[PDB]
Amino acid sequence: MWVYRLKGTLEALDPILPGLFDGGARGLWEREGEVWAFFPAPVDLPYEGVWEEVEDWLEAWRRDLKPALAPPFVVLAPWHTWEGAEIPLVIEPGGHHETTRLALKALARHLRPGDKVLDLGTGSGVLAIAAEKLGGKALGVDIDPMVLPQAEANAKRNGVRPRFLEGSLEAALPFGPFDLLVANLYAELHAALAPRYREALVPGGRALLTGILKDRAPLVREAMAGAGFRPLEEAAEGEWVLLAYGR
């Protein structure tokens, strides 16, 4: 669709808005000292502005996309430049959720070089990528077979090759037991899965569980308690926790 660009603010152009609306404006947006009026199609207007047209709401969003720090790691889109010593994780923004930040931190604390890692609900593959970069051998699984080529592409940009399979926990078990399990899921599913997490992990294995709302944390606490796990540490950020357990 088309936009009309006028000099000024909304308060200041309030008098010509009836002309925008009657002309066919369906949305307005004040972009700092200008007003962009969203039309479906162009009309004759005597206000002296500039007609324009908007796949363009993409490398506009992509321009406002910043690297996300989770020391020791930095999460970068493929087009970002970044110097220093953070461990880079190049991810197509096709993330910097709090829960991603929490999981990366905890992988860095808990992971030991050579550990076999299961990333459950791997998505973009970011946590399995991080784990290989700290020196593990990671398997990411996900039930959406359409995310896996995207996960393996992201692996390619990071010069590591964790394996990516379609399935949930059950699909992954033939390839364990594992030394670490990382899982950015949610409380009710962690609770439902707690006994099979025990089976997935070797004695002394660790499960790093996130995606959990502060409020809802007690569900997982009891389930992991129920399942014979020892608490190791709780991390938090905004309304999100990660709960870490030892087998």
From Swiss-Prot:
InterPro entries given in the database record: Ribosomal_L11_MeTrfase_PrmA, Ribosomal_PrmA_MeTrfase, SAM-dependent_MTases_sf
Disruption phenotype: Mutant contains unmethylated protein L11. Null mutant is perfectly viable.
GO terms of biological process kind: methylation
Broad class of enzyme this protein falls into: transferase
Enzymatic reactions: L-lysyl-[protein] + 3 S-adenosyl-L-methionine = N(6),N(6),N(6)-trimethyl-L-lysyl-[protein] + 3 S-adenosyl-L-homocysteine + 3 H(+); an N-terminal L-alpha-aminoacyl-[protein] + 3 S-adenosyl-L-methionine = an N-terminal trimethyl-L-alpha-aminoacyl-[protein] + 3 S-adenosyl-L-homocysteine + 3 H(+)
GO MF assignments: protein-lysine N-methyltransferase activity
GO CC terms in record: cytoplasm
Localization annotation: Cytoplasm
Its EC number(s): 2.1.1.-
Matches recorded under CDD domains: AdoMet_MTases
List of residues binding S-adenosyl-L-methionine: T100, G121, D142, S168, N184
Keywords: Cytoplasm, Methyltransferase, S-adenosyl-L-methionine, Transferase
Pfam families, sorted: PrmA
Main location: cytoplasm
Function: Methylates ribosomal protein L11. Preferentially recognizes free L11 before its incorporation into 50S subunits. This function is dispensable for growth and thermostability.
NCBIfam families (alphabetical): PRK00517.3-3
Domain notes: Contains an N-terminal substrate recognition domain and a C-terminal methyltransferase domain, connected by a flexible linker.
Similarity comment: family membership: Belongs to the methyltransferase superfamily. PrmA family.
Annotated protein name in UniProt: Ribosomal protein L11 methyltransferase
